[PDB]
Symmetry: C3
Amino acid sequence: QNITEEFYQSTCSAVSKGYLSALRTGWYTSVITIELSNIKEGTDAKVKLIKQELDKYKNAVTELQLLMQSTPATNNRAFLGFLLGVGSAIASGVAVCKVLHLEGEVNKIKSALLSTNKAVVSLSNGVSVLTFKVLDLKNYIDKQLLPICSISNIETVIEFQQKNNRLLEITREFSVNAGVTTPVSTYMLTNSELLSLINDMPITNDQKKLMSNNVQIVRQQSYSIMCIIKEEVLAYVVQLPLYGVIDTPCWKLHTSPLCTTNTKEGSNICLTRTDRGWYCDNAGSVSFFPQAETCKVQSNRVFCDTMNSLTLPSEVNLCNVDIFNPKYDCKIMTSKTDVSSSVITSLGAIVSCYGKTKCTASNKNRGIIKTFSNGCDYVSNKGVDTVSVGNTLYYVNKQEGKSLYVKGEPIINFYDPLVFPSDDFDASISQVNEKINQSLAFI
Amino acid sequence: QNITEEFYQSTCSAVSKGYLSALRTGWYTSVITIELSNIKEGTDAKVKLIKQELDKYKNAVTELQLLMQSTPATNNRAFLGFLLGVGSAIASGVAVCKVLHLEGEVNKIKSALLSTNKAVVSLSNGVSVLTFKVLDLKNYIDKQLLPICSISNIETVIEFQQKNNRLLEITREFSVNAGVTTPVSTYMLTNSELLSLINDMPITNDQKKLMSNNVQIVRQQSYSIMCIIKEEVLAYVVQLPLYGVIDTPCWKLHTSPLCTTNTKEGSNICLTRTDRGWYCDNAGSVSFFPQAETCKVQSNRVFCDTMNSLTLPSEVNLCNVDIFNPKYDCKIMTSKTDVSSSVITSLGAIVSCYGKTKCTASNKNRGIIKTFSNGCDYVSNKGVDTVSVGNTLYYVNKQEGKSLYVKGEPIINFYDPLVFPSDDFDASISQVNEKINQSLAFI
Amino acid sequence: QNITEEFYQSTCSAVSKGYLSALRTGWYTSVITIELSNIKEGTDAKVKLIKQELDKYKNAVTELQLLMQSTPATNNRAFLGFLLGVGSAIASGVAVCKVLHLEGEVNKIKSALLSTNKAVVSLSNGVSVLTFKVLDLKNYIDKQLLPICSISNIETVIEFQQKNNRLLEITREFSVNAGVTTPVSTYMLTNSELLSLINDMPITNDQKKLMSNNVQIVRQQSYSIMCIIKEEVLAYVVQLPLYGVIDTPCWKLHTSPLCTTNTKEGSNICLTRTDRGWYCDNAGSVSFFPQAETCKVQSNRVFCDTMNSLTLPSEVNLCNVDIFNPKYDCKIMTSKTDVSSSVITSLGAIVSCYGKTKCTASNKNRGIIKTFSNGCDYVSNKGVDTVSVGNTLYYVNKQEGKSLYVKGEPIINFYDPLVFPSDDFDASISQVNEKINQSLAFI
Ligand SMILES: *[C@@H]1O[C@H](CO)[C@@H](O)[C@H](O)[C@H]1NC(C)=O
Ligand SMILES: *[C@@H]1O[C@H](CO)[C@@H](O)[C@H](O)[C@H]1NC(C)=O
Ligand SMILES: *[C@@H]1O[C@H](CO)[C@@H](O)[C@H](O)[C@H]1NC(C)=O
């Protein structure tokens, strides 16, 4: 659609709006199965290759049984990303997998898939899961390999290597991942199977269209949890994202340090808005994502995970127009570190140029077209292809869109360096004012 | 076994105990070899496919020789994770690989594996390494391909593609990993080979049982170091973990911010125990792992790496019962950032609810069963399936175990906001008291 | 060459010099193509396997077309690594891929590769890109599969599975990577193709030699961007690194906390040089890399990316000899956290030993040879194989080189604990002096 951007000279920040939301709010767990064969069996070259591929099948099953001597688990914890909470990503999938170990539970799944490959099963604890038999190695081995150290053809040797290769690759992934994988590969769930799973999935037609048109993103936000091998059934849970928030406005906040440009070294004070990240309207509040690198962007669609978010009042948006607004305490950090750098935005580039640093913006066909002076400045991607700050070359995003340079005095000029609080990583406008008042009292 | 949990209302923290240790304390280096063939050789379709697979073999060897023009190296450095030291993970493996470049050293290995595939070799510097020949491409090429632009069969074309595929995949992994890979794949070392390596390994019967029952974890903590190609031998060092600490008590500390709940904005002070992470008794002290996500958990067994640990006095455990104890200076951080979030624990969930945030705990079959008020609170996973804080849904771990809610006044109530030190990421109880005393002196 | 190291007892730091630079300063974008076939077509076992592999070809094309419904994008942001700027890594490649969607542009590439596989094409916006047709599936399908539900041979079934496997694997990588991959695999660009691309690349003979001898590093610093499928052409952009800075001196700075060793707990003050990382002379300044783990090291050659760098005055090197020099304000952090740890350097080990921690250096053949006392100390890798601090065992790098122990009084002794500022993560020598002067004024 229409991506736009506004740069705020007063606070050394830029906001890119025009994006639409696609937020991971929940999980849907499906049970993928592979029906196994339980077999016990002079020789020629064609049969020797079959027995070789057959031992790869036996060892793969043995390896997966050895891998599941314990509850499946992943690694769990105990700018503002350090403010986020701590979830357990696969807790819902592990719970479903715990149910499959109850006796008779696997038999319910084995029975529902006897006449078809797609089925919805209600488990003993009342959870409605979608079940899927993607490979019937039982039917192949018992009907195309059991008739054989007897006669054989090589068209069978090849077809068995093709059909067994999926189980071998699924085992490889689970082996180097301790039974939990993300993203979900095409061996765990092919593109045809995933699209079929999304269509038979119980969701809105909006969610189906969104997931089908972005299967690569659905893969990156899914988990494959190796579950159980019991009664000739190989089952692993695939945990798929639910997008409960769709098509709400999103905007990306880019920030860079704002410093004074005095010549005498050590006299300079700096200030940086710390609330950078993705923002999306969500249920009367704003879902704020401090680590924007956790969100995936596809054109104007933004895919984030609410586990990596804070829920803030919508008044946080006021910090972009008036950082001194009386309704929200805008978060900033203070420092005396005036180092030069640049932040590439959606439609331009913020340049924090200080000291003796050479800062330019160039075009590919003409070279330098603008030389930045000391301070925090901005250039749009129209006519500009590269930005240089020191020895670092930045390419700018060449996506179409309009920028707006909002002129304003840098707020760092309003502060007396003698009473400026420094080394505050987690501060705000009011906290700095409160500390300056305490220092001015002692003077 | 028996996992239990205690929540401390006074300090907004929870401790999960009942776990057993499995700590990576050292390394064992083994030398895996692949015996190569040194060959120089109208045509039909079956031979054409053999010559195609033969050039894949030549290019794989050429590619691995080009990759080892230099010493193998990985990337090295120069809540409390920033306190950890800096190791060189593959320093022991690289040292062993440096020895294999000394002349006559590879010949010692080539000779020991002439009659068998398992052998222990004493190297020139006196290191006892386990040597393993996993693929003899020399024997296959010289006996099944050298007899051939002559007659041929397709059962050979297939068997050569199968046997050569391992060298092709080992080359692929080393190519996109600069010769150092982790975890160690099934191409580097199959499950049968790894288990065989662990059994012939010189360790306790306890370590063998532990490694064999958790090969997937052993893979994730191992490195494969591409070493040398000399005299028809392809050697790469596999660096396997040593678990010198086993079956000692472990417990996981979860912490969340504790803030005052005053209505006037900006008047609230916060406090967070920063010593969260995994703790395991280890040789009279406690091995503390500040980034719990570096540890892998299998049922009640906890796999950590001592490189990611601090060695602390056992009195650090006193911070869970009495954070004001006179024997250990409990680490905390101070802030005025009262944002809402939740921390999912082993057997429940800590909820830090502040401001206007909607915080609930729900059951799948009935919906909301508890609404949290402002402050830091806790709920156990019995009867609870989800926790919601703002727009973020958390699933709780559904593992069996008993929780205990230890009531106590939040220690944040004991502090005067007028003299409260703020923005201290690396503080402690005594440091805060020392700073408050200095502020009270000036008043 | 000659790697050397100096340890500074005064500031608990060590500098390793003797390295040569190889800095990623720019990007070169090439367009890799795969010519596709557009086909629409009782049966036997050999043909059935062909139709099975043919549907894998159709589904792979359909999957890649479904993947490119949107602009390709990656994840972007919005000790001193938090000072770095924010780039858009694939902005140059995405720009080139945007040009290929203009009409007639793909036809220009399709035409230039009709008679050869290597070609340089000038695009409509005037960018000179290197074009490469690596797979002609059109020529194979239209000439070896179109003659066929008729007669067939199995030597064709095998050759088709071999030739189609590359497209299947390229699709797999793009599927689990949202169309952007790094490092660039051997399926995206084989070793023969990459070396050929580097030779036909327009660069210095120095850059060609450097890239050819370190293709594994070039792979790790490259991106493969899935671009377009139009008019029987499968095109993806490969973004290759440009090394504009080569063979300048580099040195690695290792730092560890320096604390007082008083016996009464809580009275100790600590100080840590925060400017650790890689340093390379670059165009009159110094390119400083605060997160040394982002640089890859091959023997004495150091591969870094200027996007992960700050451009500093060369006087920053003065902090190693005289941390109180009047020309550069050396960056330090202050704390009261006196925890023990070690930092493994290039040629030795720094040991910060405090409290009751057992700190030793050992040899493999004799055990402990040195016991560290409280403070910050150092040992070289000559005669030393392991260092132990608490329950953590460190192996030291066994590379050849000379160390120099520069004796000096620890600067932490020069500070009065009563007026020592604490919890300053982003401080400097002058900022600490400025704060001590303010505290001494109030006293
Ligand atoms: C605190 O500081 C602000 C601005 O610096 C000022 O407007 C306000 O009056 C001060 N309050 C007190 C109590 O000093
Ligand atoms: C320091 O503060 C603590 C508690 O705030 C108090 O018990 C102690 O007496 C104080 N010491 C001094 C020297 O002020
Ligand atoms: C600041 O401190 C330094 C050293 O602590 C001293 O040399 C200098 O004179 C002080 N300056 C002032 C204005 O107090």
